[PDB]
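Hi D.,

Good news: the full-assembly prediction came through. Inputs first.
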Amino acid sequence: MSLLLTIAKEYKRLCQDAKAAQMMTVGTVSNYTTFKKWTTSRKEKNPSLRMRWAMSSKFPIIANKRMLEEAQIPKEHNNVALWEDTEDVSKRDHVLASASCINYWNFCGPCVNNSEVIKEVYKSRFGRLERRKEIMWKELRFTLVDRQRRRVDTQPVEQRLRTGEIKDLQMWTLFEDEAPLASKFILDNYGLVKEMRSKFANKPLNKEVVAHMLEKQFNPESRFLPVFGAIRPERMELIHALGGETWIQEANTAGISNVDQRKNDIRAVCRKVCLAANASIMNAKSKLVEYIKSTSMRIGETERKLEELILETDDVSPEVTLCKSALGGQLGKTLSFGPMLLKKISGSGVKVKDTVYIQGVRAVQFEYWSEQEEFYGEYKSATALFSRKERSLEWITIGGGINEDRKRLLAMCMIFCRDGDYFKDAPATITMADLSTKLGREIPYQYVMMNWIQKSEDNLEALLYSRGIVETNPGKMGSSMGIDGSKRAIKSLRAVTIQSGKIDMPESKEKIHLELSDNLEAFDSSGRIVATILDLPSDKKVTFQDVSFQHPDLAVLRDEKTAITKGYEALIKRLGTGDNDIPSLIAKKDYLSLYNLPEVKLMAPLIRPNRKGVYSRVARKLVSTQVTTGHYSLHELIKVLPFTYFAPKQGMFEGRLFFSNDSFVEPGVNNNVFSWSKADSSKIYCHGIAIRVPLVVGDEHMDTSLALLEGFSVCENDPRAPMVTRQDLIDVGFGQKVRLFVGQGSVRTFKRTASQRAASSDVNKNVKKIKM
Amino acid sequence: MDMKKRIHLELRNRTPSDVKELVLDNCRSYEGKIEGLTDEFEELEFLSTINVGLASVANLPKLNKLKKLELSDNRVSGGLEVLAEKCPNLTHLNLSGNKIKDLGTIEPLKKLENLKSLDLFNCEVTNLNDYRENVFKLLPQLTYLDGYDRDDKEAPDS
Amino acid sequence: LGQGIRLSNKRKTKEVIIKAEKMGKYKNLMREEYKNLFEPLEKYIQKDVCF
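Then the structure:
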């Protein structure tokens, strides 16, 4: 308004100058950032000192002037000063004041209508508070603690994201008008943005603060700390009040934040799909990628794509590793040999060949590494630090707390180093059948011995006996381990050291881009294997909740419900741009051409034949009522259209619309066959399966341009087309062109025509056509 | 969206003086306060405001030719005397889904002598004893209540 | 005499249990109303009962 005119006058006055003009004309807009630094640069050494030296003055604070006049803030209220007319040297538009002014505002100043929005701004800390209040403390005890150091997360957070996915989110919620082009993360996560926008919209707020708080709401604070007991973010946030080196405040904190359940579910799904793809013999790679992209799962309220969560988590498991490798996702330098965990500290080496005779004379190649290396190892409640040297376990130290875990870790370590005579002459018990190739897929003798150990405890005892046994020398009695795993004995194993106190887990902020083979074995720029499919449990049955396996092989439904779902999918795919589609017809109010679509003609056979006419009447009625006015709900037409193919008739409509398989849908209420919500208006749930509706048109519910972006696209720039806003963008015609402003310092030309395909297929195919 | 944009959209270049109907369902109004309404709307005879986070009726201007209103799904409570001040020619009213506790809040509606039908469903008042009868004794001119007249006479379609 | 009294710390994180025969051993802790009701009868107590 008048303010706008004032801004224009100021811009004019400023352009009248020469230097300001040169700087606002030369270069791009990014220069602003630079200019933001050359100004207001001043620091101090000991702010505490200067704070006591300033607050000892009369007017140590600055403040706005017009805000005080408008607020009717007086001066010398009760013989105590609050401010005096002056001009700070830097701002030139602020006036000195005193701290008393801050109380005078707090006690008899202007009051806002409501302020509960704060609870949303700082949701993380109110969550901290609530989690604290729901704890049941317990007694206090004194003792020594085995605090192990390690990298963990201290802030419980749902839907952990990256930084590039946030710099955009901070715009579509707060400063939308200057929003950039729509990124994929937005089009995919629409309901999330809508939720974050419903709260911080049409509100008086400082937006920078909100953006900072959102960054904190989506940042898991990772720290390298000493830790004891279970590992959960709910505890690490207050670890300071649970136990130290000499004391422990017992308290139960198990039933809060429901975090690890999501991770175990994710890992179970990963295991399932990995096994599925392993069932194949020549395309397990593409099979696995398809199973991935053809799957989704729910998180709290929203539905997220699997491949999106996998690239955000940090669970170092032999399952997640494979998936993150298929999707080209980089990861850390962490190994995995069965259930145990490993990490290399130093050393090097290279593969080498050797053979062993299984029974009598049966040569079988097995490899090892020819050099010295040092490794940290972590099994359940047990740690170890060992070294391998030319097919031998040089030394090892342990700091666990259990005998069984301490024996299993030792055995798996011995195996990992190919130490012992068994690798030189295997036992009679093993045979060529147990060797490898369940159905053709070979198995190195390593995992063979692994399962041979997991089979019987006596195999483990014999393997341990393979390690040298001697008499416990004096003094070393405490640092010794028997065969049962006892801290001391009269005779103990060879080259072993024990101690109380776990080992400090190493750390490295490194990343590597690895690959894998057709047999599901990952490699890292070397002959070393980081993961495989033999290191996971054999198999297990689970009933996954709030998941979507939209893939034929990964499906249990019959041809009937599957046909219904595919018909709905096909009917939705016609929701794009271009004539002959439902949006253009609605705009033209051609409610009749919908009845003659081919998709309804393909779904008609599924309709109950004895009452198809009556239902048809009702459907057509509803459609006209919604279409004639313009107040329609896109989630109801897509439901009732399949019935409008036949001719109306007469009869009593009970209230339900049945198919030929005794499954119905009701027009207005959600059921198992067709459900949806105003929260997430971009999803359709049929028989549990989820379907993503494109965003081409927006009904009464959808209330922004976000619902139109999948209908627009970029095209060659045309200066003839008009320039418009982001709100009038809905009044364009399908197939038209229009210029527009995007983000900042950028203008482009858009066209309301969509592109069905994505790059995943157009590159891979053309590539495979080159290896011939 | 916002009642302002919704209205400006519904007004496809049409003056706000020749319309006979309007709808604003599935919208939002800041502070639960009307925004964009004026006395310019004279020929309007129907209105529909549903699920718009409404809580009161204070900015509602004077509409005489109006003879039907809908305020369901909101949380209005207490303000029911303006109707006499702004819409004294009203006949059909609906409030199902709003915050209504006692009958004293309903008493003003007696002055709407042109009132015929009222709709109260899912409100607390309905959970009292002898409420239909007491209401009828309060509002005698009324005939239909939630679609049913005395003796449970189902009302026709329209 | 029935089941003996129980003890507890302030926060109630710890709770001790004692029989009746030993209530004469911790009389200095029990409340007054429970104390004034116990001393005049200690004469008639033998091990855990009242004559």
